[PDB]
Structure formats: C-alpha cells, structure tokens
Amino acid sequence: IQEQTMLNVADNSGARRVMCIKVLGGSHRRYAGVGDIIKITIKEAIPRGKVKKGDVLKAVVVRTKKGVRRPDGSVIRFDGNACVLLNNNSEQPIGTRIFGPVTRELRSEKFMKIISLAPEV
Amino acid sequence: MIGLVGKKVGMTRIFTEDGVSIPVTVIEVEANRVTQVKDLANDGYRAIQVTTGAKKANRVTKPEAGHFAKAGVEAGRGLWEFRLAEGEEFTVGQSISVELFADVKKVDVTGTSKGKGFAGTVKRWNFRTQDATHGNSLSHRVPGSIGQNQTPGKVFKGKKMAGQMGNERVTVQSLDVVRVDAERNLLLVKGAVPGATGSDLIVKPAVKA
Amino acid sequence: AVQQNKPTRSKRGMRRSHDALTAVTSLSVDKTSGEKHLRHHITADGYYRGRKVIAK
C-alpha cells in the first residue's frame, strides 16, 4: 500500500515495523493489496532472528485496513496492516511460525506455507 | 436490430454467490414497426420501430398521423435497424421484447450520459492538478494552457479547456445479459448503462463482438 | 487587458445586435379595463376569476 507506509510482521525473525518502499507490479503501481509482494526495509528488528535494521527484502501483505471483499461483496477488513517477510530470490516465506489471521486470497498455491499457519481462514 | 425502451434503477441478483451481478433492468415493452425503410424509396435498408406506446393524448398532427395499419397505436420515439427481414407492420404487428439473443450473449446498452453541466479542466479530463505551497491565484484548478510561444497559437483546437460535460450518447458496448422475463418485459444487464431515471436507452444486440 | 485599436461603430452596433423586446401583448384582461398581466389582476383590486380580498 503505497511507498513509505508502515506494516507489521505476522511471522518472525527480526520483527516489528518494516516500511514499504516499492509497490511491485509494473510502472505507476499506486498501492498494494493483500496477496501482493512488496519491497520492505526492516525498521525495528529483535536483537535476534536472521533479519536486522536497514535490511531490504520483499514481503507479502497478509492483512490491511482497506479490506478484502468480493462475491456478494462481504467486506472483511482489518486494522492490522500485516506483512510477513520474503527472502529475496525464492519467494518462500522466511520465518518459523506466523502470527495472526490471514485470508483466502493468500489461498494461492504460490505462498501456501503462509495459509497453513496461525490456524485461521 | 432490437427494441429500445427506458431503464429504471439497478439491482443485484445474489444466487450461487455472485451478487456481483448488478442488473440494470431496463423495461422494453412492445416495439411495432410503424415504418419499413427499403432500397427504392426511403433510401437505404433500415426498418423503423417505435418500441414504446406511452399514452400520448396530446401530440402534434403529423406524428399522430404517422401511424397507419390496424390498431393504429401511438408511442413517441422512433428507431430502426437496417439489413434483416423485419415485417411491414405499422404500430401493429408487435416485434418482441425477446429479441433473438439466446441466453448468454453480450448486449450493447446505449443511452445519453448524465449532464454535469459546465465543468472545469479538472473534472472533464483527469489531466489537471496544481499544488498548494504558494500562488493561491492559480490554485489547484486552472491549467497552464497551450504551450508554444511565437507559433501564434493555433492552440491545436483541443487540449481540454473547460466546457460542459454534455449528455452525449455513450454506448457501453459489451454487457452480458442475465435475465429477460418474456412477459414481464424487463431484461437485466450487468451494471454500466448511462443516463438515469428512465432515459430512452437503446440496448443494441452484440456488434461489439 | 486593453483594446489595441479603436472598435468601429460598425462594431459597437454589431455588438448590440441583441437589444431584445418583450410585450407579447398577451392576455391582459378577462374582466376589467384591459389591465392585469398574463396572470394576476391589479393587486388589491385584482383577482384571478373573482374579486380577491379587495376589488373596486
């Protein structure tokens, strides 16, 4: 969701705040949604965990404020602006477990590791 | 090549869990040929048809006489098609509200855009802006007009100078029709549809391809 | 800003080509001395069809 901006980490190893710096997916991407990969910058980290301040990786957006909605138009929306890091050249999720509820748009066979953690939809 | 009657509001049909379906439900009562244009005389092919019949007690004479066959009947508008093989009716020999479109084809709703009225370069075309740091005179509104200098400024009769938005036709083109209702003539489309309340509208066949 | 040279008279008149005039001399009276506009008679002595509060 736009450059700058501040998300969380619904997984681990070097946590907390991590700013988006680039919305990937072609020129003039305006924002990123849940399911979208994004260029992040570790801006907090924990003394431990292989991830530390200033570090630049990619990351998906598991949850966010604008809210998901489709078919009928049921709109789930959180105020929990997620993330969940992504080690660079293989887009597999970097992190043991994952915190918080996710969604069915992440239900893709591409992330997968993500939707079988934090027991929730 | 298909009736043309006013629409009225839009809805949602939720079953199997679409609900995305945003029906336009544009009633399309009787059509009635009223006139059949042909090669010799009338000019080209065509085939008039006044798909209406709104009680019009007071109407100018020529139109009131524009009808002539069996029941007579009167409407208001007056469209036509072209090549085909439609009847020789008048406002008699009804057409149908169930034109041949099978069940899963794309229609081509055509109406007159709403009317904003005079509108700035901001609303007319998404190209405009300006900031708020200084010079409030030319605030976030007025453009910076036609470039050029010594080229006297033939202004290239365009850009996008402010001017009324118009009510001009639109023709959304391509819109899968969901329902029809043979006798309770409504015919639902999928969103779009220009105009409001009950604009004439046209709803063509599928030329968009 | 300003005119670069004097507008001719053929111009000022040609600019005033919309003087416009009314007075459709439409229905004035239906029961008085010819008075009343196309809608209300002479107030305090007018009425549409009949004496409204005051007449003569």
Next chain:
Amino acid sequence: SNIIKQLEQEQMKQDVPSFRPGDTVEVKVWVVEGSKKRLQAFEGVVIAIRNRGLHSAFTVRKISNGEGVERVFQTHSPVVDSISVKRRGAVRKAKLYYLRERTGKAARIKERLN
C-alpha cells in the same frame, strides 16, 4: 412498477434473519464460505454488530471480532454464506446502531440488559 419493478428485490431477499438486532451476539454467523477443490463446509464468526438496513441488499452487520487482531464482514443476508440466525449475546444497545468504539479491552457493552 409500484409492485412490479422493485418487485424482484422483494422476491429475493426473503429470509428470516431475526427481524431484530441487539448487538453483542457472537452468533457463529455460519457463512457457507466454501474453500476450494472440495469441502463445502462452513464456519461462522464471533460478533458485536453495528449495521445498515436497506437496498434489499442490507449489506451489513459489521461483526467485529476480537480473535488475535480485528473485525468485520458486511455480511448482507443472501446465499453461500448462510445462516446467521443465532442470537447468543443479550443487549446494552445504549447508543444503538452505529456503535463505533473500536476499543480493545475493559470496554464492554454490558449485555444482559433485558
């Protein structure tokens, strides 16, 4: 049109939710959901409620969850996201609908106001 245009709407949402909401009801608004490949299966959602009531698409009932993080659904009323009928929490509708408090702890809506 009086009863012949708006008529399709009135002949679609033709349900029996509960004809009355008094918040805090953690109704597993069982929503058929679906998932993919097989399994129909449905799983509801804990609740609080704030809404809207209209357009035959009473697309509402913000159900605001507390599990892990936070909130919603504008779960209208029709189709593959079904039965919401349940009522498990009582009331405390003091400011009633459009109860935007969005707070996280000792802030209760003292139900049982019966």
Next chain:
Amino acid sequence: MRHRKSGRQLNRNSSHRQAMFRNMAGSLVRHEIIKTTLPKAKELRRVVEPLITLAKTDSVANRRLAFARTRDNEIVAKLFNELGPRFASRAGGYTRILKCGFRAGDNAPMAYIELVDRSEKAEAAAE
C-alpha cells in the same frame, strides 16, 4: 453545471433562512394575505403547511412542537384552536400563491400568499 432535487433554496447563511421564516410564517397566521417574493413564497409553504397540519388534538406534545418551530405562543394558539380546524377536514393545500410582480424598489416578483378565512361562527353540517 447541474444538480438535482436538492429541495428548498438558498438565500443567505444556513441559519438565516431557518430563522427568517420563523418571522415570515408566524406573520402569515396573524393575518390572511401577505406580500413577499415569489421565491420566498413557494418556500414559505414547506414551513407553514406542516404548521397548519401539526394542529389536530394538540396533546401538549404538539403545542410544545408548534411552540418550537414558530417559537411564539401568540400564534401557537391560533394554529390549534382557530386556524387549525378550519381545514381539519381537508388534506393539504392550505396556501394560495397569488402573484403580482413589480417591486419598483428592485424590480423583482412579489406574490401575496394567503389562505381562506372569513369569520368565527358555529353551525351544523350541511353541504
């Protein structure tokens, strides 16, 4: 450009109109016929009509409301007891707009605006 059924009009600040009509409407009941401007006239309907209509059985709850929209007991009484029932039988349409035009002071429309009245007596129904 264009807008659509944004019913009622502007003139001054939001409060002025909803403050002026308090003076206007209340003035109408005091008399029969008034003299304002066509625009103000047609507008004075939406305010005077519900006043005429709010009068059915008072019940205090309404004499309280009538005293609220007009804020004037002087006329609030008329609304219920005398003015009220004069039309207790008929629906709406308790206002006439008899035009005129010509202000001279500024040259704009006028219109009197009134309402049928006569005298206070009692009889038995007839027709």
Next chain:
RNA sequence: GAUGUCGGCUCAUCACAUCCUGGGGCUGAAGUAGGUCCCAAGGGUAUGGCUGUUCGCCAUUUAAAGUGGUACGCGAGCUGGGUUUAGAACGUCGUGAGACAGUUCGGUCCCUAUCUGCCGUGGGCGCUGGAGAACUGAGGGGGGCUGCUCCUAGUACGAGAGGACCGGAGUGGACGCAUCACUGGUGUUCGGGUUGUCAUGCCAAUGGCACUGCCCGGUAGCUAAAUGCGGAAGAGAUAAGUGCUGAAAGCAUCUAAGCACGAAACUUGCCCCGAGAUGAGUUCUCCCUGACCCUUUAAGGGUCCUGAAGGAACGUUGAAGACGACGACGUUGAUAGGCCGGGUGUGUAAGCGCAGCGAUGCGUUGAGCUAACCGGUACUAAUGAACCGUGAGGCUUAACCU
C-alpha cells in the same frame, strides 16, 4: 520610447537520427537470450535519496524508463530555490572609497481580455409554400499500451544446463467512458448528545448565540478508493523483406509485362459529431383552394375577409442548465408544492406512573421526530382566450397523366 534569466509546476504539440511493443536481413544466430542493420511514429515511455539544478550518481521498480524541435515550448498561467538592487559577513584584492566570472544569512513576481486563437453554447438568416419528424453520410474527431501465468511442450532444439516457434486460454499494471446497486466519503436542510449563557414568568420542556459552539451518526444527490465495460478480431492496399513466372542477356534473374505473400504505420472495422454537405441531399406525415383595385402590367404595389398545420409566449417544472438551449406537464391534469401511507435515519420523545434522600433508573416505548426518497392523492398553483406564421407554391426543358 523594455522581446522578463535557469530550474520546478501545469499543460502540451511536432520530428525520427526508435527506448518498449510490431515486421524483416545478416550473425562469430542450437535453444533462451543477445549483436548489428533495414522498416516502422499507433500507442506507451518510473517513484524516490542528495542538490536550485538541468544533468548526474545512488536505492528500488518497469515491457521500456527514447534523442531532439517548439523564444534551450509554456511567468497578461502558477512558483521565486539558482542568478544583478539596496543590509550584513568570511576569504582574497586594494593605502582607501570599494571590488570578485568566490562563498555566506536576509530580500514586494502587476494587468477586469478589445482582436486572432481556443473550449463550450445561443440569436439571425439561408436551403424557394409553410410545418413535425426519422435518416443518408461528404467529411471531422476519439480510440489504438502492455505484464505475468497455464495449455501447446518440459516437446523442437540441447552434452547437459536450459528451453521455444506457431496458435490458444485466464488474470493484471497504467489509461479512458459510464454509473451509484455494493464498499465507503460527504451530507452546516434529518435525528441525537453535550459545554457556557440569555430568554420564553417559574418546575418541566424548549429556542437564540458561542466555527454547524464542540461532537456522534446519517436520507437523497454528488462522488472514488467502489463497480461495470473498452482499447480487439476481421478486411483492402502496402513498408522492409521474401517470392513465383520470365525476357532484355538461348542460361540465370522477385521486374522490364504479369502474378503471390507481407507490420501496432496507411484505408476500413469500433465510439462520438456530423446537410451552412450554400454541392444547403433523402423519406414519411400535417395544413392553407375568399374578393377587388392602381399601376409605368407579367414586375408587381395595395385594401378588406381570413387566418391553419405549427411556433412561440406565459405558468407548474426537470436526473436539463451560467443565460439562452433542451425534456415533462397545464384541468382531456400528477408538473411542482402540500396531504395520506411506506421506506430510511436517529435511537426509546413529551406527559403520566412507580423506585431511589438524590443524580438518576424502569414502565408506558424499540417511542418520538424524520429530507431532496418510493407508492398514491387535484388540496394549492399550472385560466377561456391573445400573439407570430397564411390563403394551394418562379421560369425553362425532359418524362409520365384525364
């Protein structure tokens, strides 16, 4: 007797020496990717850090982040950071006043548009009797972007590594148009809460003012972040290029005759405008068939009687609108307002009763109030006429005809 500097913003328009996408030739071209040259201007062609910068370097995107012209496009359009006023200072120069193709902090950006030009939009008159309509389509414009994935096919190709062509299927980024049913924003005309205070005699209940006093929520409408659809296929003729057949030149040769392919370019296809198309076109329907006079008599000029179809005017109005214009309705009526009902939004009024010392609470009660909304209703206003527009339509010729 003044043509305002650089850079930025806004908004552009053209070139082609083309950055991406499209089509080809050669390659030291297996494939994939490239190298180079030809053709090609339809469309597209990045956000930031540093700096006044243009540029540049750097971070990260992208199919790509083109070169250039347009007073190094663009100040009677914005900015005023750079750079030439007056203040002050450092370094340096000078005995000094002061100075610098050095640095540094501070430092007034005017103009109501007549003409051309544009974007919109009306009034005349003309199209040869006058009207109401529906078209034809000469022309004119808009639009033309492209990613990824899967199938083909893990096949052709390859030692592996890897991995197509052609053709097809889905989903995106940016852009464009329409529209509010959904999600939402607004919603100072709807409801509520509440602070201070003045008043309505007082309690109670209400109202004015204090940014709508502060604030919560919200109808319609308008709206984007919301939703739906579009840049296509298909044709004609081509560019480069590739070719058939075949002389000049017994052969050979894509050219000399003739033929065949061939790209986002060109013509068309799609959307809009469109008969002032003065070359003023077409078709359908409606209305007017009373008397005389003076001329300088085929030119008319003029009087009375007539005035239609229609138009306009006025009024009630509108999802239409700056004003004009345009749409609906005018008693044979729903065109506005009001009124009835419903919806909706607020959130259980007022009054009364009871509990509590009281604040307050409970019951009456999901009450009270409620807009631009939906269904309906002539209660109010849309009056009977009047106005303009006529009275059977020029000559010549061709064809058809009681």
Next chain:
RNA sequence: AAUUCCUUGUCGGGUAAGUUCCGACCUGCACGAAUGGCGUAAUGAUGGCCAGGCUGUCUCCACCCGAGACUCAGUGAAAUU
C-alpha cells in the same frame, strides 16, 4: 570552516539510497590571536540537519457551507486606441 578553488576531497555516522548535516583527517587555492584566537551555561520571530506527534503539503482529489463569478432592475468607471 559564514574562510577550500580542485569539490559531491578522504574515512566514519545517520539513510533502502544523503552534492546538505554531524564526527575526523590536514593537502589551510586563500584561519589565526582586541580590523581579536579557541571555548562557553543561558537567551534567539536567527542559518543548517535529524526525530516523534500531526495532518489534504502530497498519492488523487470528493462532498459541503458562505462571499463573488451568472440573470434582472438602478447607478456607472479604467488603462489603451
């Protein structure tokens, strides 16, 4: 460095990225001791840099309330030519 031309010096720091900034080095084009030198708590509508908060400054504008702009009646300018 209010003094450095070369110059965005070189190294370190802050940053995803820092021609500015802070700490060093010294090669001071062209610092330097009352045309004062180096420090300095406090003060400053003083120059430069960073952060939190905050937000329509901005992505990208939407709606709304008012004063003009538009229409009518009255009065009635301007530069320029």
Next chain:
RNA sequence: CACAGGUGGUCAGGUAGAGAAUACCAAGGCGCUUGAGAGAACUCGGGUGAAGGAACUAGGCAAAAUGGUGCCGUAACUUC
C-alpha cells in the same frame, strides 16, 4: 471620499472566569445607503474526508497539532 487606517484621557453592570482574556447578556447603541433571484467553470474564506502519512517541496510553506488547575515526575550540561 459618508475611505475596513490614525487619534489622548475618563467611566467600568450580570453569569462564567485568574482576568480590563473570552462567551452569552444589562443600560445603551446598531444591521455597516444598490438590491432580487440563480445555485456553472474558476477565484476568496471555511467544514468534513477512505487507505497512506512529508512520498509534497528549496524548505513541512500552509495547514493539522499541543493547549487548563492540582499532583507525581524530569536528562546532558551549568556561570549552580
């Protein structure tokens, strides 16, 4: 100029308040010598804004923001 400017001193009510602030009012004085409609672009003065939150820009300019009494508690440094 019947000009949103300038001009010394005196007086000093109620509720609220630290108050000659500020808000609503007394006594008292006024609505400011063109008005009536409309409800476009655009200009001026404001209100509210989804998600983001300085990405704007020369610079956070302008906005938005903080804001009271009492009490707890408060760093480098220091001429104490």
Next chain:
RNA sequence: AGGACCGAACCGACUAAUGUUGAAAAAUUAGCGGAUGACUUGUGGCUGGGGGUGAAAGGCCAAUCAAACCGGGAGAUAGCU
C-alpha cells in the same frame, strides 16, 4: 529583587494568504515579539540643509533625501532625442 517568567491593554512588526485600477499611496485576516522598562504616551519647547538628528540603515528631517521645500540667477548648458 530582577533591562526575571506566562499573558491582555499598550508598543512593535517574524511568517503565510488576500489585496496590487485596493477598503487602504503599506492595510485586512490568522498566527508572532516586548509588555516595570535602554518601556510606553499627551502637551509644549530646542537642533535647519553641506546643515540638523542618527543603539549606524546614508536611516530620518511633512507620501520628497548620496544633500529638504519655495522663490530667484534662468530662456543654466545640452557636439543628444
């Protein structure tokens, strides 16, 4: 106690918008600095032009200041327009 602190009157003018043929030949609106002091203000008086005054900007000396305004020498001179 204090050229002490927050802040009205009062005094002053750091910022932005508007105005720029203005309401106004320097202001209005929202902020802003001082506010017992080198303070601020009424009345009257004293310094005169190469002269005055100046916490210093060539600032101020009646909308005039690198030499005021008025009258004179005066029809200065103008190889320039």
